[PDB]
Design a protein around this ligand. Structure first.
Ligand SMILES: Nc1ncnc2c1ncn2[C@@H]1O[C@H](COP(=O)(O)OP(=O)(O)OP(=O)(O)O)[C@@H](O)[C@H]1O
Ligand SMILES: [Mg+2]
Length: 283
């Protein structure tokens, strides 16, 4: 885990030029930069150290990512705490978030096979979190803005500030958590099921202007599948492009992920295999 001086961060970002801002978020601004004499492109997060939440998320991200390595996780290159600052340095993901290629965007729509491969890549990253670290890691903030795409469209899970480990956003929250008050990796499975319906339906997980039954995609899409009308809320670009057996396998997998009770949901390894099976059924 590399430690950067603050002058390196300032140089990498061209003195935090607004030219290089990729976005703003609760933690702070995210900048595009380059390091190593310009051979490595980076995403640089500048937080606010006066904030308890920011400080807690900063330390959580470092303690988590400093020990993980996986093709489908964004890599932490380093950090800077110099001058009591909170800066995180990541691999740059040139194609942004999964969400920016699904809706409310002028990016072209993604072909179905590409969407399925993005979901498989994200599932492999989550499966690694649940089974490949020293203890189970619960991400706790799985959503389409926290799946990033690199220049070859490889999907990477990002944003670990809320994750939790060790043997103890609105439309993505596991409702069973508000009832059983327990932490389980099945809460990531739930969130990921919502991401799968987003890839298929190309609309927000939560749209608060709709009819009550439609507001939450986690409830609406299973309901439409049972009434034989899921095909009617599928992304218009996808209509006629999914084979019947792929569609059924994909939809049944997503429905199982958003069951009310976590004990009935599949593991991420089971989700991952069913998606790869769905991809074979598409061919
Ligand atoms: N490694 C990266 N490479 C390229 N772009 C990134 C990278 N990490 C973040 N970004 C971009 O930075 C922007 C801000 O991301 P941020 O983490 O603030 O999301 P947020 O939705 O504001 O916060 P949260 O989702 O955790 O509430 C997003 O547009 C995202 O595309
Ligand atoms: Mg995010």
């Amino acid at each position: 885990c590399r430690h950067f001086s603050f002058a390196e961060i300032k140089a990498a970002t061209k003195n935090f030029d607004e030219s290089r801002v990729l976005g703003v978020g609760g933690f702070g601004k995210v900048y595009r930069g380059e390091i190593d004499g310009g051979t490595t492109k980076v995403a640089i997060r500048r937080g606010n150290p006066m904030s308890e939440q920011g400080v807690h998320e900063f330390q959580t991200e470092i303690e988590m990512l400093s020990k993980l390595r996986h093709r489908h996780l964004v890599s932490l290159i380093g950090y800077c705490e110099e001058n009591c600052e909170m800066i995180l340095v990541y691999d740059y993901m040139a194609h942004g978030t999964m969400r920016e290629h699904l809706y409310k965007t002028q990016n072209p729509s993604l072909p179905w096979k590409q969407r399925l491969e993005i979901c498989i890549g994200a599932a492999r990253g989550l499966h690694y979190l649940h089974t490949g670290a020293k203890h189970t890691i619960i991400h706790r903030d799985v959503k389409t803005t926290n799946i990033l795409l690199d220049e070859k469209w490889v999907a990477k899970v990002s944003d670990f500030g809320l994750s939790k480990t060790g043997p103890t956003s609105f439309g993505y929250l596991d409702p069973e958590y508000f009832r059983r008050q327990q932490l389980t990796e099945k809460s990531d499975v739930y969130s990921f099921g919502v991401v799968l319906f987003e890839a298929l339906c190309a609309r927000p997980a939560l749209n608060p202007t709709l009819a009550k039954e439609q507001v939450s995609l986690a409830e609406w899409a299973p309901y439409c599948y049972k009434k034989g009308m899921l095909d009617q809320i599928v992304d218009p670009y996808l209509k006629g492009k999914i084979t019947p057996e792929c569609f059924k396998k994909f939809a049944e997998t997503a429905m199982k992920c958003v069951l009310d009770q976590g004990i009935e949901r599949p593991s991420m390894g089971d989700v991952l295999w069913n998606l790869e099976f769905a991809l074979q059924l598409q061919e």
